[PDB]
């Protein structure tokens, strides 16, 4: 499965195994998962931008 990383490999690939074909369980209600990080993340990201 690591053969798909041949060539340039740094950070974002996120396709190797086929386990990502079907999603995980179903839609659920969670604050960190289903919404977003805190406002300080958008503030520091906006300042970095």
């Amino acid at each position: 499965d690591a053969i798909a990383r041949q060539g340039q490999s740094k950070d974002k690939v996120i396709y190797s195994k086929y386990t990502d074909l079907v999603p995980k369980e179903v839609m659920n209600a969670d604050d960190p998962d289903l919404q977003r990080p805190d406002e300080e993340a958008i503030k520091e990201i906006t300042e970095k931008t």
Binding site: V13, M27, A29, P37, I42, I45
Partner: protein, 315 residues
């Protein structure tokens, strides 16, 4: 189990009179006025508050394929089939500045919520990122084998995305002057893109199937299926329903958190005798989601409201 009691969505009002098919649609942040890009080469402005119009904008060399409303300044970003993407100043009743660098027609445009920049989906396949207020640009986004259908960006982690005709939805990380990831989920060209108010998962759609992907890290969300047709647009509202407009005229409302859509809407908006296959090219949800602006190739913008009924069936 189809929870959260999806309410039925119905019509509100009918509008017509445009000289050509409506390519794009946009609304003011305070719901004061509306605007629509049209095939007639003149930028349309319609104030819908009473069912009225707004103003007739002119000077676009070709049909406007997109428009945007800046929150900070009264300048509506303009994009059209003329390959000239020009943000317009409306303060003087005349434009702001004309952006440059697009090699071909601009299929889309977007505005960053925090930083000042101009995003564009250019049929050259080039998605233009522009440092804007300075008259500057920012960076050129490439890598799509075919033309970029859609563009989306946010002030969160580098979520940037451009829907591409090449069947691989593009993901750009702009912060580094870079990209993000290649999305192979869509089996065909994705002409639809949406950003849900949940903000956790980026939404997209294609005629083959609709692809919803939970981001930032490269994770996905779900595969929306059951509507087979060319997908003109996808719009996610705050109530949990996302209307999907099609070129065939079938708008399918979406229950999302339930795992499947909230409605299959088949209706005839057909104008007088000229009809052919023209469907609804674009649609927009209101601020309070009390109505839905319907822009169709028949030059009829029809808002959609509900009758406040119980209903709530299942399947």
């Amino acid at each position: 189990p189809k929870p959260q009691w999806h309410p039925p969505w119905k019509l509100y009002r009918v509008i017509s009179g445009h000289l050509g098919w409506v390519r794009c649609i946009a609304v003011e942040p305070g719901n004061q006025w509306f605007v629509t890009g049209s095939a007639d080469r003149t930028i349309k402005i319609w104030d819908l508050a009473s069912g009225k119009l707004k103003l007739s904008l002119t000077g676009h060399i070709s049909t406007v394929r997109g428009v945007i409303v800046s929150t900070r300044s009264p300048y509506l970003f303009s994009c059209g089939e003329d390959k000239q993407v020009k943000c317009w100043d409306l303060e003087y009743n005349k434009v702001i500045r004309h952006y440059h660098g697009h090699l071909s027609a601009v299929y889309g445009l977007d505005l960053h919520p925090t930083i000042d920049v101009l995003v564009t989906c250019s049929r050259d396949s080039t998605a233009r990122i522009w440092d804007v207020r300075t008259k500057a640009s920012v960076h050129t986004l490439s890598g799509h084998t075919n033309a970029v259908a859609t563009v989306r960006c946010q002030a969160a982690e580098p979520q940037i995305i451009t829907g591409s005709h090449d069947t691989t939805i593009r993901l750009w990380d702009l912060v580094a002057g870079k990209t993000r990831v290649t999305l192979t989920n869509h089996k065909k060209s994705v002409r639809a893109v949406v950003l849900h108010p949940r903000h956790y998962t980026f939404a997209s759609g294609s005629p083959d199937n609709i692809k919803q992907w939970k981001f930032p890290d490269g994770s996905f969300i779900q595969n929306l299926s059951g509507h087979n047709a060319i997908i003109n647009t996808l719009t996610v509202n705050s109530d949990g329903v996302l209307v999907s407009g099609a070129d065939n005229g079938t708008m399918h409302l979406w229950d999302w958190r339930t795992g499947y859509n909230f409605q299959r809407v088949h209706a005839a908006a057909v104008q007088p005798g000229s009809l052919d296959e023209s469907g609804i090219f674009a649609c927009a949800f209101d601020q309070s989601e009390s109505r839905l602006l319907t822009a169709e190739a028949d030059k009829t913008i029809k808002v959609y409201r509900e009758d406040d009924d119980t209903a709530t069936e299942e399947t």
